[PDB]
Enzyme design. Structure first.
Site: not given
Ligand SMILES: [Fe+3]
Ligand SMILES: [Fe+3]
Lengths: 262, 250, 264, 249, 239, 244
Positions: A159-160
């Site tokens: 995930c960012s």
């Protein structure tokens, strides 16, 4: 209908778009498309692009690169400067869109200079998401990736790192390093699914609720370890990671109401 | 002795039958019979039957149906009402047998109606079926678990249902009458517990008491869900929700 | 009113009766009635009766007798057979009344035979109130005592002092000597492991253990010993209630109202 | 000698004849009230227990019952501490203006009941006490905590508050302005946690984050309450409910 | 690429023609033994499974079944490690003398069947390591061959459970090995029962110590009937 | 018979003796005798002795002197030299006898030199002392009852035990091993564990806790492990059997 028909819908769009560039994240979604493109179109006719950036760890980049070579794909590392975008740099709610817009713009240009006919991503149920255009649900990806013999892919979704900071909070190399080092340290104790939410001087740890029991033994070490990374207070989220996901009928709907109040 | 000689007995038996109906559960044994049936007799000479009933989850039925399709078989489900038999509904220690009789009896009617020469099941060298004349060709060819794994490896089979299930009747004490309501509530409870991350679970039925059997090494992790499990299973219709101190298969 | 007016109303009532039999439970209220009877009427004019039965532990009875002897009263134990009454033996929801009716009848038999002018208890449904039916007097209730005013006189007079097993059985379950022993032995074993507040609820072949939830974490190391011990006491299954001891007391607003709804 | 301290203390009370006592339930003020009652009688001693936004009703209700349990005429008084902005802005000197508001009300009570002095339980930052003319007779008679415990055993006192309750303001960072709502939020949260079986608890306020301090040795006992605590405190208005891995303080 | 690695290892096998394979039953030897069978044929491959006291019967009985399952000619051999004085008295060098006994026997088997090399699973010839197979590459090619069954606990020599200088005996090894069989059976695959004469010091990964609380009394009573006086849990955990 | 009768027997026995020396450990048994002695004979006729030695903790010694002072006694410390007896030092099952001999010998010369009529100790229902509670047939239940009756509230609520029990029979005690064990239990007690034993096995520490506390202890594993190692143990371990 059957998986075979959805697979055949997939094959047909690959053979129709003679060449493609594959936006390859390393997850099972892109593992599928990258594999399918190769065996329908050939190593000489498919290029793999793994984005590199400051919002993702050097490990997720390194891992996707090896997975793409080991699928027989010709792979290309490409490097994005997300933090030079003021929306992303300042983590407004619309950050995600400008970050994807910077992303697909790069693949537009890269696909242009390799003769590709479209840019494919791995989204399921102007880039093309054939998995979505073939009615692949989560259950269909696992099954197809099973029958194709693919066994290696990001088991825990990447995930960012923007997800760890509040909106409006400006991201800095110190910030991200602070959050990435803290999640890396937790993962090394056996918590692969972990978030360390950043709240200035409070660090706020989300674990799978099933794992909180096992975590009690690492309290003091986590506390002293993360403090030395610059957090004054190291805390544990009593809701856990993906709260409400495992709550009963009544407390998931209540927890959604709180989730929507912010 | 060789797997080669055992594969040959099995191939020869299938060629002799020409046309079979297969009792298909999704396990490695019935996956092995179905894949050998398809390679020997062709897709048009093989019928995969999957039983759908109140004593097993819809999800498990859906898994077997998709697995038979993934092998390239013509698969049809058949729906059985086990509760019509008063031995099964009153759950006597012989309910197991009258259930299997109702199942094999239904397969034969399917087999009679599609022109198959035999019903095939997945039993290996490790009643009621023998009374119906079903054939277990892995057991006739002296297959053990390891030869099934050997021939599955050689045929390239890597996908079957790793957890063969058991009838929901095991959640009720002998003499307890099985109703549609208490079957559903028992199945919902175990479904909810699986969603929390407890793959091996049982909710044993004791009228207003639910008694939860877990692996003991998993009970430490379970405490964080006590209050949610307790209120969830009450909203399913148990008055008291408990955890067996003896554990799984106490 | 005043506590002065309350002791005075209480003193006058005792002076009138001149000799009394006191129903003595060991509680704060009956400790107060018993010690006030002694100071107003003297030891010769007061009999403390303590009831023994199957529905209470020997330890608790031996305690009440020892608390009353420490007050300087002439104390007598009496043994009741509560299971003789079919309301009590069949555990009907009114069995508490038939218990009190059986006890007040026996006290009234003791009081007639020792010359007391009244039976006294410490108090502050299917018929007449067992007290009115038995002629018993609750003089702290006639003197309008609250828990507070009782609390005043116990320390003031210089005192320091302080459930039926039937509550472990579902309504309608018939209670036997064996199964009552079974519940009491089970709870005694759990108390010895360090769990003072416990219940072992009887569900025929199932034992259902209620603990304070804040202790369930520290109970796991006993799971296996508890299970084999209660099975040797005659339970086929030994289980632990996930709601705990008094389910719903320690929940949030929304789930304490959910747990309340389900009980009906 | 303890006899010489007890004798100085009896002599002081006989002279005052009628007193008002600031009563906390603690061992120090329980001893002052029990000596006052034994020297001057119940009619001549008034127990005052302060109730306010910065302290729990549970602490107040308990001191009220302890005061009746000693046989005293006990009276409650409500203080509005947030009227003083030194208290409302939560500066390091807020406890003086709180203490000053308190002694001022005790003076007013004693004027109206005829007491010659206000008594508290101080023994050997009490400036506010000196400004109001209150008397600390355990300190005038050279009592230390060991003399207090000795005379308490000698008078046979066995019941008093062992927990020395602290003001809720300690749950807010210095300088964070205290409101009625954020005070309620912290008080309701801590009340709920104490009701689950955790007497020693702190909920530290960080706006939308509640940070829960428990004694570490109780964190294992707490696991069964994670989901309930999390939803209860969100319903009190916190966005995030967390547990400090460092423990209590 | 995997197809390139598979090629590097297919050609190397064809070179050697006849191979003898040291077979432990883990995914590495399993992948080597299948490739060797598929490249050279059954008649040119001899799988050796070693039987000794430093490892479990279950590991031996499992590897022999799995190699046959793989379609190979399997031969057990029994090493007598305790006849080496270094092994027997457990010196910090013992690992070396153990490897000397082991590979010597394998060479003796291969010289005597006319193999060209002893092969093992290290990632002797480690052909997987020569072709630069990584842990992921081994998983990829195993699933590609339809392999699903191998031994997923990597065994370790029991000498590690003993202090340096502790004379091994058939009794203390038996005692230690049964203690870990019992613990493994409770749901703890990674465990060490360290031998301290009358004291057992149990090593578990720290993430599992909480899950272990329910077995304290049973593990205590069990290992004591195996001869320990005191049964204890290392607060430091595994490693 | 009744507690009031047991109390009288104890007062009458005390009034007989007139002057007494009291061996004072600070637990409810010892505390009850010293209070009754003070309440029958007064401060000037009662001598509280608190024993200081290497086999018991300084923290327990400073507490007993404090409580004897708090109870209204003239309190006297005395220091025993247990390890100077070779039966004690080599830790044989006879040690208790020589330790009890050394202890009551010191008390008797104290009582002889202050002219008490008897040495008193706290034993409830070893011959140089009188157990007036045991003579009056006091049980642990009778002691709690009479204690609350007198307002006694403060005493050592964990029963202190001699540190030689932490060593195997035959292991000669040294000032170093004792210090090591004492430091380990001081540390564990400071985390919230009043009842603990650290059993000494040379390079191995065996920590004995009540089982009901073993769940709560997991949060301390790494800290106890690191601390007890800097005290000299190589392996710090937890007995699966728990306290006793
Ligand atoms: Fe606890
Ligand atoms: Fe766990």
């Amino acid at each position: 209908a059957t998986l075979a028909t959805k697979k055949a819908t997939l094959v047909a769009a690959l053979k129709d778009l003679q060449r493609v560039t594959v936006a390859f994240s390393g997850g099972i979604d892109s593992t599928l498309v990258l594999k399918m493109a190769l065996d329908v179109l050939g190593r000489d006719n498919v290029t793999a692009v793994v984005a590199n950036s400051e919002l993702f760890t050097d490990e997720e980049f390194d891992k996707a690169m090896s997975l793409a070579e080991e699928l027989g794909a010709n792979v290309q590392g490409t490097t994005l400067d997300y933090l030079s975008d003021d929306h992303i740099k300042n983590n407004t709610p619309d950050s995600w869109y400008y970050a994807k817009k910077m992303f697909y713009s790069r693949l537009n240009d890269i696909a242009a200079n390799n003769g590709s006919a479209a840019v494919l991503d791995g989204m399921i149920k102007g880039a093309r998401s054939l998995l979505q255009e073939a009615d692949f649900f989560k259950t269909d990806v696992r099954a197809l990736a099973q029958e194709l013999g693919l066994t290696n892919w990001n088991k825990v979704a990447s995930c960012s790192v923007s997800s760890r900071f509040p909106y409006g909070t400006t991201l800095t190399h110190d910030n991200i390093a602070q959050v990435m080092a803290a999640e890396k340290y937790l993962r090394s104790l056996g918590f692969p699914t972990v978030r360390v939410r950043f709240h200035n001087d409070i660090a706020r740890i989300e674990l799978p609720e099933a794992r909180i029991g096992d975590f009690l033994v690492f309290n003091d070490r986590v506390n002293r370890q993360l403090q030395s990374l610059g957090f004054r207070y190291v805390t544990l989220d009593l809701g856990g990671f993906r709260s409400g996901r495992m709550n009963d009928t009544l407390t998931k709907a209540q927890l959604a109401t709180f989730a929507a109040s912010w």
